[PDB]
Design a protein around this ligand. Structure first.
Ligand SMILES: CCCCCCCCCCCC(=O)OC[C@@H](COP(=O)(O)OCC[N+](C)(C)C)OC(=O)CCCCCCCCC
Ligand SMILES: CC(C)CCC[C@@H](C)[C@H]1CC[C@H]2[C@@H]3CC=C4C[C@@H](OC(=O)CCC(=O)O)CC[C@]4(C)[C@H]3CC[C@]12C
Ligand SMILES: CC(C)CCC[C@@H](C)[C@H]1CC[C@H]2[C@@H]3CC=C4C[C@@H](OC(=O)CCC(=O)O)CC[C@]4(C)[C@H]3CC[C@]12C
Ligand SMILES: CC(C)CCC[C@@H](C)[C@H]1CC[C@H]2[C@@H]3CC=C4C[C@@H](OC(=O)CCC(=O)O)CC[C@]4(C)[C@H]3CC[C@]12C
Ligand SMILES: O=C([C@H]1COc2ccccc2O1)N1CCC2(C=Nc3ccc(Cl)cc32)CC1
Ligand SMILES: O=C([C@H]1COc2ccccc2O1)N1CCC2(C=Nc3ccc(Cl)cc32)CC1
Lengths: 191, 99, 50
């Protein structure tokens, strides 16, 4: 009965957003003081799989981030049809929310098809000179194409990680000290 | 001022995590060591406020111009956003003294 | 933001006509941008004193 009150629902939503931001911080936790994987070298750690299987496998933190953003797209698509494309599209912060969710979705879509190409190439050929169908795998960062579907994912993921911090403005007008500050920012943003 | 420092810290931490996630995989393949660790991303985006961070801190050596153009756009948006937050802090400080 | 150097406008030949055109255009650009910023500040002040 306490956990279905409005204030506890607000606290639970703020806590889930805090968990999402902490996951976005701690996802790149092996590279805080150094990557230890140079763009010239290659590491597989199994001596049977190729290099593009280690760089394309989803971790558990990435699976949790995918779960959070799928829940966010679901909770936004449930609300866009309740108000229609007249009250939703009129507000310009819904543009920012839909853009952040779309860029996250495109990043995960590109990472999935990169992993699918890598898994297909590792499945059709399960140390000699490899043939001319899986030779654009087990390669370093220099010899990737400029339109590789993993660097598209890594490019969109940074924009989505920057844009996901704009949801503080949804929980910020509940405070007595940072509410009028947001009101003053929105007052001056028009000029 | 101590209420706009929180907004400064929010924009700073957001862009720090974003550009560190963008440039961490190019640690030995850049012109300088910026945005390759959390310390270098910190000392790049902090001294970009006073104009002590050069614009070639964001380019790479390979022909991946996708990630380089993402870095240019993110760094320009960071600079414009910091100038906007400073110009709003000035108006808030004016209004807090005309009362 | 002051991250473009002033030697971005000079050439190697002895065509100082085009180089002086470039100096004048770049200085006028910088002064005009400062003026538009100072007018944006006053508009933002007037939009908050109402
Ligand atoms: C070629 C040049 C490129 C230009 C790019 C520059 C970007 C300009 C940013 C302006 C932000 C602003 O003033 O927003 C005003 C208020 C919203 O007012 P309102 O109109 O009241 O919006 C109400 C929103 N609502 C309560 C309805 C959810 O914003 C905030 O609340 C600030 C949030 C604090 C921290 C966020 C971190 C961001 C990291 C990227
Ligand atoms: C360095 C930066 C990036 C901080 C990282 C993100 C979070 C740890 C911060 C940012 C925004 C914060 C929130 C801003 C506003 C509030 C409202 C506050 O409650 C009230 O003020 C209203 C109570 C009432 O109704 O009387 C509870 C804390 C909370 C959720 C904060 C919880 C912690 C948050 C999520
Ligand atoms: C919620 C709203 C406000 C989002 C705003 C959009 C931008 C913040 C994002 C989304 C689309 C992105 C762009 C998508 C395509 C391009 C072209 C691309 O160009 C190249 O790849 C160079 C050639 C090569 O070597 O492949 C580089 C990234 C870039 C500029 C991206 C820059 C950042 C953009 C503009
Ligand atoms: C509508 C009004 C406000 C127009 C204002 C006038 C200026 C914007 C223009 C018109 C005349 C131009 C000038 C004409 C003559 C000179 C001298 C010339 O000097 C040399 O050629 C160096 C020696 C050589 O090697 O030939 C270089 C360009 C310059 C400064 C020009 C600079 C830009 C000027 C001042
Ligand atoms: O410097 C920047 C950023 C700085 O931050 C920005 C912030 C908001 C909007 C634009 C910004 O541009 N770029 C990106 C675009 C760039 C890359 N290739 C081309 C080709 C033609 C043109 Cl006309 C431009 C370019 C040049 C370098
Ligand atoms: O730097 C500039 C520009 C910068 O932008 C300007 C904007 C508006 C008005 C003047 C500006 O001067 N120049 C141009 C003039 C210059 C070229 N030969 C001489 C000889 C004697 C003197 Cl006394 C000066 C010069 C020096 C370099």
């Amino acid at each position: 009965k306490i956990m279905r009150g409005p204030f506890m629902k607000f606290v639970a939503h703020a806590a889930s957003f805090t968990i999402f931001l902490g996951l976005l911080v701690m996802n790149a936790a092996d590279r805080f003081e150094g990557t230890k994987l140079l763009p010239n070298e290659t590491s597989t750690d199994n001596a049977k799989q190729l290099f593009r299987m280690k760089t394309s496998c989803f971790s558990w933190m990435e699976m949790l981030i995918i779960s959070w953003v799928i829940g966010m797209i679901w909770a936004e698509c449930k609300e866009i049809w309740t108000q229609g494309p007249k009250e939703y599209l009129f507000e310009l912060w819904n543009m920012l929310d839909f853009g952040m969710l779309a860029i996250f979705a495109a990043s995960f879509i590109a990472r999935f098809m990169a992993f699918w190409h890598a898994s297909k190439a590792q499945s059709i050929i399960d140390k000699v000179t490899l043939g001319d169908n899986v030779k654009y795998y087990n390669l370093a960062r220099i010899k990737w194409d400029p339109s590789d579907p993993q660097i598209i994912s890594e490019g969109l993921y940074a924009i989505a990680v920057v844009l996901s911090f704009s949801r503080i403005a949804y929980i910020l007008p509940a405070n007595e000290s940072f509410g009028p500050l947001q009101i003053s920012l929105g007052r001056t943003v028009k000029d | 001022i101590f209420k706009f420092m929180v907004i400064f810290i929010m924009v700073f931490v957001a862009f720090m995590i974003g550009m560190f996630n963008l440039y961490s995989y190019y640690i030995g393949a850049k012109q300088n060591e910026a945005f390759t660790t959390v310390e270098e991303s910190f000392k790049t985006l902090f001294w970009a406020i006073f104009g002590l961070s050069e614009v070639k801190s964001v380019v790479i050596n390979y022909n991946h111009k996708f990630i380089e153009n993402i870095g240019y756009v993110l760094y320009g948006v960071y600079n414009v956003t910091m100038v906007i937050v400073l110009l709003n802090m000035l108006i808030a400080m004016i209004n807090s003294s005309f009362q």
